[PDB]
Amino acid sequence: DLADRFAELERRYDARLGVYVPATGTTAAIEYRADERFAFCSTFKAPLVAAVLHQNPLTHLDKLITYTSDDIRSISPVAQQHVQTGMTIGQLCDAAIRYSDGTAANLLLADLGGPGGGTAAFTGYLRSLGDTVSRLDAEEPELNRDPPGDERDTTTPHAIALVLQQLVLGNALPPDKRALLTDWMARNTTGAKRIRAGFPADWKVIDKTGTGDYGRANDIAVVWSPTGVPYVVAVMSDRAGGGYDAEPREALLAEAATCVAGVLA
């Protein structure tokens, strides 16, 4: 009866909702509009950090990057306080995930190199993980701002869930680098009212949120049951009916996550 309950959520919040939870050896996939395109918004920052980790030695994390106040585009809770000092690649990764720092993301994109200030390289990385669907076309903040229906800067709940699965539970990264991404997601500061709010306290939740115009609110997570069984959960939403200024609704995500948690228990 989950399709009906998700539909009820959509009507309640005047929203479009997308949900994907991959199948496991003991559970069926949960899917709702799982193959429809949604804007990444900040959820791209998790695989962006993976791409940076993948393409460089650990010692790269200690490279200091310098930038100016004019490079700050974009909600950047950490970068805003370190113009004078600069930030290391590792500090940028930490900020991009845990504070969803947009300047940190733009700098990591630049670090990947190549056309589109790194967006092509980022998209190439996803392709290397078997994701033929997702695309990144702009940097921060423009990537949050494409109109509904625009294919630019989009993924699908299905595609991003399969990517996150490989990054955290699979072998996309070696154990030491995998641990770094996992730790940063585990200590995320921006997700308390989203997937975390839908799972009981005895479940571990690591996540990366995304927020944008047209009422966009996303969250991608790996969760572990009270006995240690992992699931990947991707929830994406927008409220295009309210136009550019529509307010994102975190409760929609918490409610969808609650539905998911009840099935997985």
From Swiss-Prot:
Pfam families, per the entry: Beta-lactamase2
Q: Where does substrate bind?
A: S100, T209, G210, T211
**Source organism's superkingdom?**
Bacteria
PROSITE patterns (alphabetical) = BETA_LACTAMASE_A
Q: Which Gene3D superfamilies match?
A: DD-peptidase/beta-lactamase superfamily (3.40.710.10)
Task: Give the catalytic activity.
Answer: a beta-lactam + H2O = a substituted beta-amino acid
- Molecular function (Gene Ontology), one example: beta-lactamase activity
**BP GO annotations:** beta-lactam antibiotic catabolic process; response to antibiotic
- Which EC numbers does the record give? 3.5.2.6
**Keyword Hydrolase attributed:** yes
Q: Where is this site: Increases nucleophilicity of active site Ser?
A: K45
What residues make up the catalytic site? Answer: S42 (acyl-ester intermediate), E140 (proton acceptor)
Where does it localize?
Periplasm; Secreted
Question: Site: Functions as a gatekeeper residue that regulates substrate accessibility to the enzyme active site. Where?
Answer: I75
Q: Which keywords appear in this protein's UniProt record, sorted alphabetically? A: Antibiotic resistance, Hydrolase, Periplasm, Secreted, Signal
Regulation affecting activity:
Is inhibited by clavulanate, sulbactam and m-aminophenylboronate but not by EDTA.
Relay the record's extra comment. Answer: The class A beta-lactamase family has a specific amino-acid numbering system, sometimes called Ambler or ABL numbering and often misspelt as Amber. A multiple sequence alignment was used to derive a consensus sequence and then the consensus was numbered taking into account insertions and deletions. This allows use of identical numbers, e.g. for active site residues, despite differences in protein length. UniProt always uses natural numbering of residues, hence there appear to be differences in numbering between this entry and some papers.
Could you tell me what this protein does? Answer: Extended spectrum beta-lactamase (ESBL) that inactivates beta-lactam antibiotics by hydrolyzing the amide group of the beta-lactam ring. Exhibits predominant penicillinase activity. Also displays high levels of cephalosporinase activity as well as measurable activity with carbapenems, including imipenem and meropenem. Plays a primary role in the intrinsic resistance of M.tuberculosis to beta-lactam antibiotics.
Relate the assembly described in the record: Monomer.
Q: Which family does it belong to?
A: Belongs to the class-A beta-lactamase family.
Protein's recorded name? Beta-lactamase
Q: Which organism is it from?
A: Mycobacterium tuberculosis (strain ATCC 25177 / H37Ra)
Record lineage: Bacteria, Bacillati, Actinomycetota, Actinomycetes, Mycobacteriales
Gene that produces this protein = blaC
